[PDB]
From TrEMBL, chain A:
It comes from the Eukaryota. It comes from Toxoplasma gondii (strain ATCC 50853 / GT1). GO terms for molecular function: proton-transporting ATP synthase activity, rotational mechanism. Signal peptide: none annotated. GO terms for biological process: proton motive force-driven mitochondrial ATP synthesis. Belongs to the eukaryotic ATPase epsilon family. InterPro entries: ATP_synth_F1_esu_mt, ATP_synth_F1_esu_sf_mt. Coiled coil: none annotated. GO terms for cellular component: mitochondrial inner membrane; proton-transporting ATP synthase complex. It holds the Pfam family ATP-synt_Eps. This is Putative atp synthase F1, epsilon subunit.
TrEMBL record, chain B:
It is found in: Membrane. The chain holds residues 211 to 262 of 314 of the full protein. This is ATP synthase subunit gamma, mitochondrial. Belongs to the ATPase gamma chain family. It comes from the Eukaryota.
TrEMBL record, chain C:
The chain holds residues 41 to 183 of 183 of the full protein. It comes from the Eukaryota. GO terms for cellular component: mitochondrial inner membrane; proton-transporting ATP synthase complex. Transmembrane segments: none annotated. Keywords: Hydrogen ion transport, Ion transport, Membrane, Mitochondrion, Mitochondrion inner membrane, Transit peptide, Transport. This is Putative ATP synthase. The keyword Transmembrane does not apply. It is found in: Mitochondrion inner membrane. GO terms for molecular function: proton-transporting ATP synthase activity, rotational mechanism.
TrEMBL record, chains D, E, F, G, H, I, J, K, L, M:
The chain crosses the membrane at residues 8-31, 43-70. Residues 6-67 form the V-ATPase proteolipid subunit C-like domain. It comes from Toxoplasma gondii (strain ATCC 50853 / GT1). It is found in: Membrane. It comes from the Eukaryota. Belongs to the ATPase C chain family. The chain holds residues 96 to 166 of 166 of the full protein. This is Putative ATP synthase F0 subunit 9.
């Protein structure tokens, strides 16, 4: 489904672990979604001369973009 | 440290005879592409923990 | 050491077992569920979802259930001097079944079906179907 | 003298292959349901299509057996 | 007329094929329950559904055998 | 009530093989659906193409059976 | 007459088709047990259900092999 | 003109024997499309080639049936 | 005793199916032992259980052979 | 000589095993093209070698048939 | 010399299934050795036990053939 | 004088098994080649050996048939 | 008149199953070689033992043919 959909196993595993964390009980779910927030800042280069810079706070948009 | 990491070109250039001792529940050709991403992820994980 | 099964069940956020000696360990392989014990051949397998069930040597009858989303299992033969055969269950998210819920599960299922009703992309359709799979497994596994 | 009975019994013998096909079909159904339990309606629909074809062939052979018996 | 026995016996050959199908189906169950022992119910449902048709086939084979026997 | 009935009955022995082929077809369809549902409309298509031979062949045999029943 | 013995020897041909079904079922039991011993006594039960059919489908034909022998 | 019909009916067995093989071929096509949907062509060509081979065998046997039925 | 001898000869076709079931069982046992040797004895037990059934069928047909060869 | 016409049919019955074999072969070919497509040039070659045998065998199964239809 | 050689050749038909079972069993042996060489000697044993059934049945078959060749 | 032709046809009605075996041979060749191309030279090296037996059997399956056509 | 030839031809029919068994043997051989070349030399040994049974049975078959084509 993933080698056909052009998707990696890591992406699939992460996006499914997200749902499994959403299916948690609130006391442990708090610590789970706590320990699994996201904050990244991608910076693309081409022989110097930065092409773009973009922030990421979600797993889905981080794998998509 | 410096880790020489395996890549798909280097996997295709090898017949992977060293893993014949292991029984892969899906076939090797079908599970290799999913195993290699896990390998990549685990490599970065431990390296960055040690660096931290 | 002993002719037991040295299990290590590990997620990134928590290692539940490190060198735990057990008798039998059930795992939901991608093809189908299967139980690993000492003497089992060297093997690698990809897991899909469901309830790992561990059974210690001291327990025998008592068990321990853990829901796994996805990951791998690695069974390695026993060294000649160790006398014990090892097994490594790596999971990207390994919860117990006590910490699961069927209502938030069904809510996430409904929201997934809502998002996937506009089936246009292959990854969206595949994610909807796999979410259906995993959430049905969670519902069937939760108490 | 009783050749129609022989002909009927010889025409009936395709039920073995029909049942083999039905068993293979429902075995595939059961396996695919054990694997993907969230996908049962489409598999059941295709199984119904196959069973319809196979029962059509079976009723064809039975009708021809009855015809050859009571021509 | 002992000849009418022969046709009936010939009809009984189909039962072997039926048995083969039944065997395959139950093998598919006994495998599926091991691949996914959580359900063990939706597979038995399809098993019984298929066994309905297979038993019907066996029963009509037996009935045609008895018919060609006595007549 | 002679050799024509015997020949038209012996012609029907191919329906077992045709049914086994159809069963294999739809079992493969079911397995492919359970594996990758997202290409259902493809697999069903190919299955129909297969039937476009297998079913037709069966019909051929049935017709020739009648041709041997009224030769 | 002695011709009935031929009918009997034809009626014993369903045996050896029943044997493949029993073999397939018990082989599936063996494989599912080697894969998942934890659920052994369930699969055995399912085999006892399958033989609940097969053990009949055999001896039934053997009885016919007698009835179309002595008559 | 009684032996010709029986000859044709006996020659018709290869049709049922050939339908098996086409079933397996198209099952393999289905499974290949399920395992690698990115490659639809280059599987249908080989599938159609094998179908052509088995169709050639079918045409052979049907031609010989029609021949022997009137010669 | 010609027809009796022919009946006894024809009785011994089921041995092929008996042998095929035996081979299936022992193949499954060998595969399960290659997978998990630690479940040898249990598997052996189940194998012998099925073999008992197959043996019974074999003995039965042999006996019937003898009967149709003397009575 | 009507039995000549029978003999030819019997010589054609082997086609039921032939086409099956060919089907299995091409099935494997398709599976290979679904697993390691980049080496089609090998697999097709091997398949052709296999056909270079199977074709020849089938041709014999025709030729001898026609010979038994004339001589 | 009709019935003698006829019954002999007929009884000598069930060895194909014996050969098929032997082939399946040794194929399982080869696969198990490929997957787990460490218990090679533990498989060979079981395969010999399989022969201890299979070949024994074959022996019985051949003996009965000779007995009906000189009954 | 067609009984010789009938015997030749019956002796020729076993090439289907040789063809099925050859198909399985080349199917396993193609499968193991797609799984591991670098070892093709061995899979072929054994494949030819298998043909070195199978074709020889087929040669007998022709030769004796021809003999039964004349002697 | 064609008793001996017909009985020889009917005996010669098991060569199909023999060739099928040999094909399964060498298929397992090539598959195990593809899956573990390091033990290739071992697998072939067992394969030869398989031939040591299969061909042996085939030889017995042909000997019986040579016995029955001349009484």
């Amino acid at each position: 489904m993933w080698r056909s959909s052009g998707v990696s196993f890591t992406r699939y595993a992460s996006e499914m672990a997200a749902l499994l964390r959403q299916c948690l009980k609130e006391p442990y779910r708090t610590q789970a979604m706590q320990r699994n927030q996201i904050h990244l800042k991608e910076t693309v280069y081409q022989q110097g001369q930065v092409l773009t810079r973009e922030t990421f706070n979600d797993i889905k948009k981080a794998f998509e973009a | 440290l410096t880790l020489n990491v395996l890549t798909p070109t280097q996997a295709a250039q090898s017949a992977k005879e060293q893993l014949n001792t292991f029984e892969f529940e899906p076939e090797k050709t079908d599970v290799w592409k999913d195993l290699q991403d896990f390998y990549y992820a685990c490599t970065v994980f431990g390296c960055m923990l040690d660096n931290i | 050491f002993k002719n037991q099964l040295l299990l290590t069940l590990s997620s990134p956020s928590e290692a539940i077992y490190v060198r735990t000696p057990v008798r039998s360990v059930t795992v939901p392989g991608s093809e189908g569920a299967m139980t690993m014990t000492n003497g089992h051949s060297q093997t690698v397998a990809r897991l899909k979802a469901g309830e790992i069930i561990v059974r210690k040597g001291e327990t025998g009858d008592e068990v321990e259930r853990f829901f796994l989303s996805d990951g791998f299992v690695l069974f390695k033969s026993p060294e000649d001097d160790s006398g014990c055969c090892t097994a490594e269950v790596l999971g990207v998210e390994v919860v117990p079944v006590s910490m699961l819920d069927k209502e938030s599960a069904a809510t996430a299922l409904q929201e997934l079906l809502q998002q996937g009703a506009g089936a246009t992309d292959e990854w969206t359709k595949a994610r909807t179907l796999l979410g259906q799979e995993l959430l049905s497994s969670v519902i069937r596994a939760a108490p | 003298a009783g050749v129609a009975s022989l002909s009927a019994a010889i025409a009936l013998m395709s039920v073995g292959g029909v049942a083999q096909g039905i068993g293979s079909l429902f075995a595939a159904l059961v396996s695919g349901t054990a694997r993907n339990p969230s996908i049962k309606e489409d598999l059941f629909t295709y199984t119904l299509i196959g069973m319809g074809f196979l029962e059509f062939l079976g009723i064809i052979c039975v009708l021809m057996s009855a015809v050859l018996l009571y021509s």
